[PDB]
Design an enzyme around this catalytic site. Sequence first.
Site, mmCIF file in Angstrom:
data_model
loop_
_atom_site.group_PDB
_atom_site.id
_atom_site.type_symbol
_atom_site.label_atom_id
_atom_site.label_comp_id
_atom_site.label_asym_id
_atom_site.label_seq_id
_atom_site.Cartn_x
_atom_site.Cartn_y
_atom_site.Cartn_z
ATOM 1 N N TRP D 11 0.855 -1.164 0.000
ATOM 2 C CA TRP D 11 0.000 0.000 0.000
ATOM 3 C C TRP D 11 0.883 1.202 0.000
ATOM 4 C CZ3 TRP D 11 -5.019 0.563 -0.548
ATOM 5 C CH2 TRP D 11 -5.775 -0.566 -0.475
ATOM 6 N N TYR D 46 -0.871 -5.767 7.637
ATOM 7 C CA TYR D 46 -1.419 -6.809 8.477
ATOM 8 C C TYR D 46 -0.703 -8.137 8.328
ATOM 9 C CZ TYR D 46 -4.885 -9.042 11.263
ATOM 10 O OH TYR D 46 -5.541 -9.658 12.261
ATOM 11 N N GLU D 47 -0.109 -8.414 7.171
ATOM 12 C CA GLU D 47 0.528 -9.700 6.971
ATOM 13 C C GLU D 47 1.983 -9.697 7.360
ATOM 14 O OE1 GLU D 47 -1.138 -8.372 4.085
ATOM 15 O OE2 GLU D 47 -2.885 -9.129 5.047
ATOM 16 N N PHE D 69 3.406 1.786 5.421
ATOM 17 C CA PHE D 69 2.838 3.082 5.694
ATOM 18 C C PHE D 69 1.367 2.893 5.938
ATOM 19 C CE2 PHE D 69 1.624 7.441 3.975
ATOM 20 C CZ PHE D 69 1.924 8.093 5.110
ATOM 21 N N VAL D 71 -2.123 4.661 7.141
ATOM 22 C CA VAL D 71 -2.645 6.010 7.124
ATOM 23 C C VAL D 71 -3.878 6.123 7.950
ATOM 24 C CG1 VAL D 71 -1.571 6.477 4.959
ATOM 25 C CG2 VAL D 71 -3.880 5.569 5.016
ATOM 26 N N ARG D 77 -11.498 3.204 10.611
ATOM 27 C CA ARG D 77 -10.493 3.381 11.662
ATOM 28 C C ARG D 77 -9.243 2.541 11.418
ATOM 29 N NH1 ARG D 77 -12.535 5.987 16.188
ATOM 30 N NH2 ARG D 77 -14.660 6.626 15.686
ATOM 31 N N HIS D 116 2.197 16.329 0.868
ATOM 32 C CA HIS D 116 2.345 15.277 1.832
ATOM 33 C C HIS D 116 2.940 14.056 1.212
ATOM 34 C CE1 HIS D 116 0.180 17.122 5.168
ATOM 35 N NE2 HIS D 116 -0.130 17.940 4.181
#
Lengths: 206, 206, 206, 145, 145
Positions: D11, D46-47, D69, D71, D77, D116
């Site tokens: 991501w 998550y992995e 990263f 965000v 959430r 950003h």
Amino acid sequence: EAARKMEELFKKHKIVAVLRANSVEEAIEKAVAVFAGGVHLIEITFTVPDADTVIKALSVLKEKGAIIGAGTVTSVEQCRKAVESGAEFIVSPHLDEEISQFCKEKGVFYMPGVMTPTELVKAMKLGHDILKLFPGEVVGPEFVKAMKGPFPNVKFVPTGGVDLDNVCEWFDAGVLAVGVGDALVEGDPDEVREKAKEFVEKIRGC
Amino acid sequence: EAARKMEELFKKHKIVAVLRANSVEEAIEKAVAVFAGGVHLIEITFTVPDADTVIKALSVLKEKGAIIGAGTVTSVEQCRKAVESGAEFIVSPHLDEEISQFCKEKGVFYMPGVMTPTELVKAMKLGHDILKLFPGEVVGPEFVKAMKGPFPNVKFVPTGGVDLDNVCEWFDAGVLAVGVGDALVEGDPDEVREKAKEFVEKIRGC
Amino acid sequence: EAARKMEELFKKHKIVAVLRANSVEEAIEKAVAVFAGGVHLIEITFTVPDADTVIKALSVLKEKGAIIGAGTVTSVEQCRKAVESGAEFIVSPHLDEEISQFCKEKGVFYMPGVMTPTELVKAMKLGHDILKLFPGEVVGPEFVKAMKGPFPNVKFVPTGGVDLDNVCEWFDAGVLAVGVGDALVEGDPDEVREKAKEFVEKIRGC
Amino acid sequence: TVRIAVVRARWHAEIVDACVSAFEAAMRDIGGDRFAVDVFDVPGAYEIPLHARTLAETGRYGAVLGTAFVVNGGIYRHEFVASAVINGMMNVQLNTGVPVLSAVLTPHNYDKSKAHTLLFLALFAVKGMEAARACVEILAAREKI
Amino acid sequence: TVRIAVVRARWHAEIVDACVSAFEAAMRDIGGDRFAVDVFDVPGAYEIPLHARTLAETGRYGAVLGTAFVVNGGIYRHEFVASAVINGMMNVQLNTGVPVLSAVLTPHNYDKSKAHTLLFLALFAVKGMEAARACVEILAAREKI
């Protein structure tokens, strides 16, 4: 290769003079007034008497940074004359297959005219990314903005409908360069030089 | 058969949203705000990143009465992707023979873009009775009225040049449906839902 | 070869940010605010803590058109560190022979500082056509105009004494680019981005 | 030669890439010819804990660096994932005996504006460089003990 | 053929269903004839960790995807469950050796108005599609290792 060279030149100079005159000497005096005033890209309408003579005579300005092309070319025979007599650009009011093939063979830059979405597409299929909008006035800056969505890689040079007051209205629409004439060009050589300066400064602002 | 289904749907709903966004989530939030606001016909511009993802995600609204099509399709390869990924409609800014043949074979509704009388005729010869006027702004409601005489069976969906103030100016000209976007769609999802309601009520009046 | 590349870049971009900060993160936030605001030539003062870290971190902007150099380099050892850590430019407050020889061997652009006619000459003899005027404020635009006569081929980048109000006062004197800092750079990252835009537009005017 | 594995989220890959690229370059400058870096991908943050555990238990790596990263999430959430991932790596580290390091960062407030995206590319490049130093220093500390 | 199990919550089933349906369709498009999907139900999000563990320890599944929609709660606090469930799945993943994935989402602020129910059906359909890609990519990564 010629297309890349020209795309950079149009981005760099922004204003292209479209010149017509009733004589060889008049065309020359105006081309010089326009050049001196800061406009380096000049088209010599090729449908006028002695168009070849004017383009060859103005080749003396080529070494000073002038680019002289052939305006309003509507046929292959005229393209051949324009190519022998200099003519860095060949432009036309309408798309034409014979002209495009000729121009590719000779290594010159060709910019066909288009006023509709179906014509933009045919021109793109033939390899033309920079198109002229001949019927300016009729087709305003709204067209240029509207066609940006479906054709993000097509750039325009509108002719007509461009005057000093609408300078930047056109550039804000995504215009590459403007085919100004009958404003920039018309009048006395000293009036012409001063107007050329006004157009360049108004353009520099955007 | 698809053309008949769609002609009735456009007559019934009148306003078609033309949606673009900078992300998948943004496109979805807007499509829902527009749908909730009363606009059931939505085109997803297909030239945006992740267009297929947005069309498949919004298939969840299909059972609630949403019709999701593929906006601004300019090629066959895009049409193929649009067809696998839902896309009840395929629309384009210009007439194209390969797209039309593809769409007929797949059983989907195709609505080509046209802006001139010679193009209306070619589109009619190919079997297209409902046409889109891509260059709105340039071609106003006067065109729609003018072409009613010689082509009484051609219906239009103008895109662009349609805002809230000209709602009904277009319908009074003989318009079938309006391709509203950059008004209906632009802004915050709550602003979008309220504007969608304003367009629908202004339209219901005529 | 490097000198020719840089001369064109300075002519093209005009404003060079001179950046200092009290930390690595602060230097990065400012470099990005300045870049986003339209200033592409940025010097990282090399006398600050972690100067090498900042220059390497900002190499991520190189592919977006940023040019990151090493500001205020006063020795060869610092030049060596600046060269390993990127640093397209090496600039210094004073002329130095060891730095110049090093920079030539490494293929990097070196711009020594000068404030007098005898120093301009020594720098020219060593091959430096673009010079920095370190003691700005003390040496105003009058110097740049005055030295144009005897040294028509020497171009200047003044540092200091350049603020928003004197933008164009310096360019009217024959200045190549301006070493703006403590105006452009100082303040909050959002204040910095807005000031960078003001400097660029004020500069575009001349 | 000691191998270090890097496990990358996909991501916001441009940001994640700024970090790993800087990491590899720093590793060459600090421990060239002593360390080697093997880069592996996973779909997202998550992995990381499982992939990292699998690598650590393989015996080929002296250290594993996870990067991602995370965000704010917009509509959804993010806090629940961010804490699960960090704690996941901590549990792996402790029960495997491999100094799993991390550069799984969650910004205070990330906007999608180019200002950003540019800031985070640069900051992640910095984190990459710092991680390279950390890898070398912790591995050395673990020999001295 | 590799089997993937899906464990679904039954609260707000319409939203949960949008996700699993999209997941299955995406799996056919990406890994048709390579993967099969077995869908199981549980009462709600809290039971996912155990059901998922039981499936994972059975040996039949290459991966397990848990899905649920957790909402703000109105009268009651939801945070305690949302974190227990995510951490639960992480512990299962690590100690079972199965890449348990999740699409257990908690919205920032979910209203019961139809505008929101429609938004979440569409967003969950997106998450389903993303999960299908993640399943295939992580399973492949785990063979390459």
